[PDB]
Each structure stands twice: as structure tokens, then as C-alpha cells.
């Protein structure tokens, strides 16, 4: 095995010693937790992650596709710089309410815009725009005008979110996407469900890319470091 | 519970999916096989990307034995980005430098044998740039990025030093941070051991500093050196 095995002691240690994880973050993980869809939600360790890579990225626009109760969006807003601001893509009013909730316990709005709808059309919008819309309004616009990707949202849609993805990254930016493993099962080819056939597409399309360079990081469920290349 | 459990064919999987490597490195890995103390090919595009991804142009390797992680930041650096290894063993960067040479690197990468603990000293205390480190850099907040991989009962003191020699901003990455799991186990009172636990404690609980400690390979902890304001 190239990577260690985890242990729950391990990971308890892990967390002990990495984790600082303010009142209202786990606030809101325990609130998560009372619904269904719990488990859509990150770790806070994968939270973690997503804050240090912020800011060694240097990244000041952001846009996150699929918010959710919005754990990585309180992730990616506090590790912004006073000027960093991000987008949050997502479908779902009951959800995004939540995630405001946090958003404004945590002093946050300012740094946050929302767009709900589809994030294919939010994101073309954004690519043909020739002036801001009134949602992107001193965020970006345009192609070429975004640091940092989260992409969290539907997965078999994964192969379809790439290329506008790239397109609306500066060069030398940065995609995180999530979920790349799918529970082990993107290895398993008797998995053929949708969402496992976008993933494995959109692993086969990042890797072939020459445009680009990855990291596949065993953190969570799999979190791919796809760094545009410059030129 | 928190990580997916990974299967040596799950391995394969992220193997094929992501790493895109060189036929010198490869070699090297073979050749350093002949004689476990170095990383996957994996962890080294990590490394890799990380490289790209902090802009960094100035590198200090501390433990560098027969050299994949430098190739890895040689390689990903531009081409005005520079590398200072530090290592003990002049025997296994003689075939750090076998590859560096092999691969065109060497104008971008500096060494310096001995005890590191000096070397950062030296490097910390320096009025003008000591030959080795000439056209480097030198003094405090000089430094953009820091692979920690030396001797793990050191870790402890090879923190103080990396922070003054990080500019703010500035990352560190340790290998080896959790050990084979034995920092999680208190029986496990290895000198080596003890060094690494503690090291986590003092980056945990530095203000100056946050922390991202991924279970990748035996534990990679990312730290940075927080901006001050
Ligand atoms: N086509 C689509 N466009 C935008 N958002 C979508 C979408 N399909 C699903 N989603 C949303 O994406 C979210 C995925 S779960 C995202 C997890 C979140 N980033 C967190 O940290 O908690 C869900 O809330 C879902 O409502
Ligand atoms: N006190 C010390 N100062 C500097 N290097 C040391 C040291 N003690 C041991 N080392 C060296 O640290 C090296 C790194 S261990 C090998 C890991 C290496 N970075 C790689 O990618 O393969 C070994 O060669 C060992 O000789």
C-alpha cells in the first residue's frame, strides 16, 4: 500500500491535531447531520484542507458548484482575503437557507454570492456575459476570470461542468473536485449508475488533458487538485 | 469513517487516473528499490502541483537521500525558481545528482551536506550569501516553501528555524507526520516518534501558523506561515 491505513484512533488523532473548529462550523455539522442527505456534506478535515489550499493559491474569486448546507463555502469565505470573494452555485432554496443562516452567524455574506438555478446555465451565463449580471456584480465575469473551482454538485453532470470550468479559469488556476473516488466505486466496473460513469469520465478527461496537471488525493472520498496550466 | 478505505486495486485506480510520469523517475525509483525511505510517485506529483499552485521560486529540502522529492520540485519550479537540498549523506545525493543531471536540473538546485539544524542556522545567521547558498538566498523570510523528510526526532527543532526562514505566506510541507500510525499510539515512546508528535502539537497550537494534515502517503502536513497583519 502506498498510502497508510487509517484507523478510527488514528483519524481521532488526526483531527485533535489539525483541527480548529469554531462553535458554529460544528453548529452546523451536527445540524446536517439531522437530515437525510447527511453525508453530502465534508469532513472538517476535508474542510481544513480547502482553507489552507485557499490561501496558498493566493485565490481572491471563487466559485463553488453545489453548496448544500454550505460547510465548504464557511471554509472558502473565512479563508479569503478581506477582498476574496466567492460564488456558490446550487439548485436548492431550503439548503442555500440553511447555509446562510451560517453565512450571517459567521459575518460572512459580504464575501458570498448566490445563484440559484441550474449550474450549467450559471455558468455559461457567466461565460457570455458582457457585463456582470446583477448576482455577479463585483465578483467576475467572462472567461478567463475565476482562481478556484469547488466542484461539488451532481455527478453525472462532472464531465459536463469541466469544460466550462476551464474556461471561466484563469491559466495557472485551480479545480478541486470532489467525490473523485465515489466510494471505491469508479474501481469497480460492475458499477455503471449515472453519477459512477461521470466521475470515471470526468478522472478519464482531467488525466488525458495536457492542458492541465493532477493531484488525486485520497482525503474524504477522493479530491482531485487540477491545476490549469499557464499559456 | 472520515476517509475512504483504500484497496491496493482502488490504488491501481488512482495510480492510472492521475500520475503521469517521467522514464528517468521511474528509474530512479527502481534504482533506489535495489538499496522504502522515499515516496510514491503519487506523493511526488502532490509535491508537484503544490509547487505550481504556491508560486514558490525559493525551496529548501531538508533530507534529501536519493532525491525524487527534489526532482519533483526542480522539475515543477519555473524556470528562475531555485532548490537547496540538505542532506548527511554525500553517498545517496551522488545519485540525487546522477538524476538531476540526467534531467537538466542542476542550475536550479543547490546543496549543501551535513547536520541541517547548522545549515538553516548558518543559512539564518548569514550577513552575505555563504558560497553554497550564493545566488539562493539567505537571512529570515527569505524562503517561499519548505519539504521537511530529515531525521524525525529533529522535527521539533527544524520548526523554529523553517518559520524564520519562511517569508509570511510562506509553506512548509512534513512528510512522515503520522508515522506509521505509532504518534497515535502512546506505547510508541521512539525518540524518532516523540519528535513527531511533538512537532504536531507546535504546529497545532501556533497562532502563527494554520495546518491541513493529509493522510496522504505516511501523513503530509501542509503549514503555513499566516501573513502578518
Ligand atoms: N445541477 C445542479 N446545479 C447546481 N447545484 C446542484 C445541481 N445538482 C445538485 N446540486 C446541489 O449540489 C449540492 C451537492 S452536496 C454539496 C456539499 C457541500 N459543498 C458541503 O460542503 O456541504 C446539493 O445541495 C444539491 O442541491
Ligand atoms: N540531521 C539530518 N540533516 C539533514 N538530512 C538528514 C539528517 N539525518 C538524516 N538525513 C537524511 O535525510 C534524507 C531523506 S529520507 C528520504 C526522503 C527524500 N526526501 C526522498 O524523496 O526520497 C536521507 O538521505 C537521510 O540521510
Redesign the interface.
Known amino acids: 500500500?502506498?498510502?497508510?491505513?487509517?484507523?478510527?484512533?488514528?483519524?481521532?488523532?488526526?483531527?485533535?491535531?489539525?483541527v480548529?473548529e469554531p462553535d458554529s462550523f460544528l453548529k452546523l455539522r451536527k445540524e446536517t447531520g439531522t437530515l437525510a442527505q447527511a453525508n453530502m456534506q465534508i469532513?472538517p478535515?476535508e474542510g481544513?484542507?480547502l482553507?489552507?489550499?485557499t490561501?496558498?493559491?493566493?485565490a481572491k474569486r471563487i466559485i463553488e458548484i453545489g453548496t448544500f448546507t454550505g460547510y465548504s463555502s464557511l471554509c472558502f469565505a473565512s479563508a479569503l482575503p478581506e477582498d476574496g470573494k466567492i460564488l456558490c452555485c446550487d439548485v436548492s432554496e431550503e439548503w442555500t437557507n440553511v447555509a446562510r443562516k451560517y453565512w450571517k452567524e459567521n459575518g460572512l455574506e459580504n464575501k458570498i454570492f448566490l445563484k440559484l438555478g441550474s449550474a450549467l446555465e450559471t455558468l455559461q451565463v457567466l461565460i457570455d456575459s458582457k457585463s456582470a449580471p446583477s448576482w455577479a456584480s463585483d465578483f467576475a465575469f467572462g472567461p478567463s476570470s475565476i482562481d478556484l473551482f469547488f466542484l461539488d454538485a451532481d455527478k453525472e453532470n462532472y464531465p459536463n461542468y469541466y469544460p466550462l470550468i476551464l474556461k471561466l479559469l484563469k491559466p495557472?488556476g485551480?479545480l478541486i473536485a470532489d467525490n473523485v473516488?465515489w466510494?471505491?466505486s469508479?474501481?469497480d466496473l460492475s458499477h455503471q449508475e449515472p453519477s459512477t460513469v461521470g466521475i470515471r469520465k470526468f478522472?478519464?478527461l482531467?488525466?488525458n488533458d495536457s492542458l492541465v496537471?493532477?493531484?488525486?488525493?485520497?482525503?474524504?472520498?477522493?479530491v482531485?487538485?487540477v491545476?490549469k496550466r499557464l499559456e
Request: glycine share 8%.
Open positions: 500500500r502506498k498510502n497508510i491505513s487509517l484507523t478510527e484512533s488514528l483519524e481521532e488523532y488526526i483531527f485533535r491535531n489539525s480548529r469532513s478535515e481544513q484542507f482553507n489552507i489550499l490561501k496558498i493559491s493566493g495557472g485551480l473516488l466510494d471505491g469508479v474501481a478522472n478519464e482531467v488525466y496537471d493532477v493531484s488525486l488525493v485520497p482525503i474524504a472520498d477522493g482531485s487538485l491545476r
